């Protein structure tokens, strides 16, 4: 992981989530459950669908073409054909082989990026109202039910509503 | 109470090489390489290719008796000989600029 | 088909093939390799 998401601080991925690529695991008083963030997942797929499209669609420049047509009293020119034909085969193989290897590293890192940005989007909404565990989780200082947590996903979470509940829970432990 | 973030993973086996790592097991994938063929030679944009089975081009232009010149196809895209066609010239000889005439006749409209 | 080869005939949607070097028509690019697979998802962890 370049962004330190996937190999890094989130060791392993939720197998029970099968809605999207990226998402959340709530475990509050009402129950537990996975819930995938479809909006960020959609942008990723829109992106990847467009990479793969672009790698094929840009090579549309191809025309007519042929095979071999010289007699054994013109072997010099037949060798010039071979040089050219083998030459292109070398270039295209190399360029293709590497292009895959290069765009595959960045494709994997684009996912790391999306996950670290999602974790950061949650982190910035709830500054001192929760505790950064380091397994990429968030322990709440206050009680947040199923109707409260949609606000975190939606991104409409009120800091001032639950500010005093957490702040004055903090000094109780700090003895 | 908790909210913890993560990323999908399923039961896929499809390995993909990358520049810094090799044989990396990845969730989904796309093939870019065409590996398959129908194994039977076909038209090029509606145009019947000229297939010469036991006959070469030389023997087809001239009236070689052993193969047949019943091919009244008036249009083609490419010619198809075999490796060593069995009937080049019944009466032995030579054809002048044969290869160039071959190229000329390779694709005819009428 | 849109292009031909001594072995067979090719579809030619994707941009590389590995069938036969000497082709007739609008073929993709002949490449000497068995695998060109592109990543779309992310690292699968067991």
């Amino acid at each position: 992981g370049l962004f330190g998401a996937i190999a890094g601080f989130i060791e392993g991925g939720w197998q029970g989530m099968v809605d999207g690529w990226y998402g959340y695991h709530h475990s509050n008083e009402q129950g537990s459950g996975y819930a995938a963030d479809k909006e960020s997942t959609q942008k990723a797929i829109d992106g990847v669908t467009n990479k793969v499209n672009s790698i094929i669609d840009k090579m549309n420049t191809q025309f007519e073409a042929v095979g071999r047509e010289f007699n054994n009293l013109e072997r010099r020119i037949e060798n010039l054909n071979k040089k050219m034909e083998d030459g292109f085969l070398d270039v295209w193989t190399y360029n293709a082989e590497l292009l895959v290897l290069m765009e595959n590293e960045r494709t994997l890192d684009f996912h790391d990026s999306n996950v670290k940005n999602l974790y950061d989007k949650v982190r910035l909404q709830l500054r001192d109202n929760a505790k950064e565990l380091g397994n990429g989780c968030f322990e709440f200082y206050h009680k947040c039910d199923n109707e409260c947590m949609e606000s975190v996903r939606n991104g409409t979470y009120d800091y001032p509503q639950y500010s005093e509940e957490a702040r004055l829970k903090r000094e109780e432990i700090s003895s | 109470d908790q909210i913890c973030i993560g990323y999908h993973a399923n039961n896929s086996t499809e390995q993909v090489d990358t520049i810094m790592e090799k044989n990396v097991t990845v969730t989904h994938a796309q093939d870019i390489l065409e590996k398959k063929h129908n194994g039977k030679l076909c038209d090029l944009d509606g145009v019947k290719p000229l297939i010469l089975r036991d006959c070469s081009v030389a023997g087809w232009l001239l009236g070689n008796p052993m193969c047949d010149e019943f091919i009244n196809v008036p249009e083609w895209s490419y010619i198809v000989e075999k490796a060593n066609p069995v009937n080049d010239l019944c009466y032995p000889g030579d054809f002048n600029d044969y290869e160039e005439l071959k190229h000329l006749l390779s694709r005819i409209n009428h | 088909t849109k292009c031909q080869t001594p072995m067979g005939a090719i579809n030619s949607s994707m941009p590389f093939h590995n069938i036969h070097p000497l082709t007739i028509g609008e073929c993709p690019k002949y490449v000497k390799s068995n695998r060109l697979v592109l990543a779309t998802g992310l690292r699968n962890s067991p």
Epitope: V18, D19, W21, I45, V52 | H8, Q30 | -
Partner: antibody
């Protein structure tokens, strides 16, 4: 841009599989849904199948007797229907929608006549 | 399920006038995710409008949508020969996603 299979005529009880090949050069990016229409009367939505993961959602009306699969390489969706009645006789449409979700629609298929009278 | 009812089931209007199709929902419709579609005889459906009021691409300005919550309305300003057909509303806010039962528009004579 969307293509469906040909007409098929089955006896009641016998099952029917219908294929909607989207296109799409590549792996599909769009959630195929399915909407039937018994001649004369209007449209009845059946089920949708999201793009990348293969997870389907059906209507509570059918649930136990309909299944829709997804073949990722060729970007084709399928629709299997079990224990067919006389009233299942209809025209079945697949519809792709603008992204994997599935939510609004946009591009509709052609359709497939399926007669169930024996 | 959320059952949608359309009205009126048949409009009899002349070429030029305004048509006003209704779509009432048994319950509120989650976040204005309702759509209208047009079907002519023999053909497959067209998309007209999604998200209550947003036009789809390749559609005249005379088709326009409105409403929210439980009541929704599709209006056509200047009817023309091509518009006489069946019109279906659907909600897609939650599974199962249901359709209205056909509000047809025919020529007056």
């Amino acid at each position: 841009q969307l293509v469906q299979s040909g007409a098929e005529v089955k006896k009641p009880g016998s099952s029917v599989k219908v294929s909607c090949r989207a296109s799409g050069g590549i792996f599909r990016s769009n959630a195929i849904s399915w909407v039937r229409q018994a001649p004369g009367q209007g449209l009845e939505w059946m089920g949708n199948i999201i793009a990348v993961f293969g997870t389907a959602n059906y209507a509570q009306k059918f649930q136990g007797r309909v299944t829709i699969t997804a073949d990722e390489s060729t970007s084709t969706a399928y629709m299997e229907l079990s224990s067919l009645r006389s009233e299942d006789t209809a025209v079945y449409y697949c519809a792709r929608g603008p992204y994997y979700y599935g939510n609004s629609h946009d591009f509709w298929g052609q359709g497939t006549m399926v007669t169930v009278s024996s | 399920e959320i059952v949608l009812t359309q009205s009126p089931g048949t409009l009899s209007l002349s070429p030029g006038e305004r048509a006003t199709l209704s779509c009432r929902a048994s319950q509120s419709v989650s976040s204005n995710y309702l759509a209208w579609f047009q079907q002519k005889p023999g053909q497959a459906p067209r998309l007209l409008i999604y998200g209550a009021s947003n036009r789809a691409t390749g559609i005249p300005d005379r088709f326009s949508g409105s409403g929210s919550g439980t009541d929704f309305t599709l209006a056509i300003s200047r009817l023309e020969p091509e518009d006489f057909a069946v019109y279906y509303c659907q909600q897609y806010g939650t599974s199962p996603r249901t359709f209205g039962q056909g509000t047809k528009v025919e020529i007056k004579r």
